[PDB]
Amino acid sequence: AMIRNIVFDLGGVLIHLNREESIRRFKAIGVADIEEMLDPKGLFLDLESGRKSEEEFRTELSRYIGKELTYQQVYDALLGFLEEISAEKFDYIDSLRPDYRLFLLSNTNPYVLDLAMSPRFLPSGRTLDSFFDKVYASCQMGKYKPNEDIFLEMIADSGMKPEETLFIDDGPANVATAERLGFHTYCPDNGENWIPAITRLLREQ
Secondary structure, three states, X not given: OOOOEEXXXXXXXXXXXXXXXHHHHHHHOOOOOHHHHOOOOOHHHXXXXXXXXXXXXXXXHHHHHOOOOOHHHHHHHHHHHEEEEOXXXXXXXXXXXXXXXXXXXXXXXXXXXXXXXXXXOOOOOOOHHXXXXXXXXXXXXXXXXXXXXXXXXXXXXXXXXXXXXXXXXXXXXXXXXXXXXXXXXXXXXXXXXXXXXXXXXXXXX
């Protein structure tokens, strides 16, 4: 076979996202300039990249809006992003494990990770970590897509050959970097059922 390893993003690929809803929740707790804060420097980047801890980001965000925000408040607003956790795509990934090495490469924050590593993430009670040989999370690594450093740490740690790896990410810049490094890529839409198309890619010799 072509492909020995498959790497998935979380947001977009496995969890359908709804940014508007998170924008709504952030506004309701006083983060008024949220829409520009969340647009593609910034403390939301400090949050993904691990540069600020959760505690540090919230302290600064509180200072920024002139209002004290709790863990629970921000957690609740960030989780407005998560419109559907695809049970069927996790089931499909679970079927892939004996035949492939499976990895997650995700820009994400401690809040989503707290959710993902709980028994409330999926109806099955299965943790995110349980579907992959390894999880590569921006905030755990101090690095973030689309920089090459995060891809390179992943390669070194897993031993995956890029030309034997399929990278599934809805982020155009993330895909462009994986192409540059020699990965097979597929760029789904946020909310697309990509199971048939991926099942196809894996068939190839």
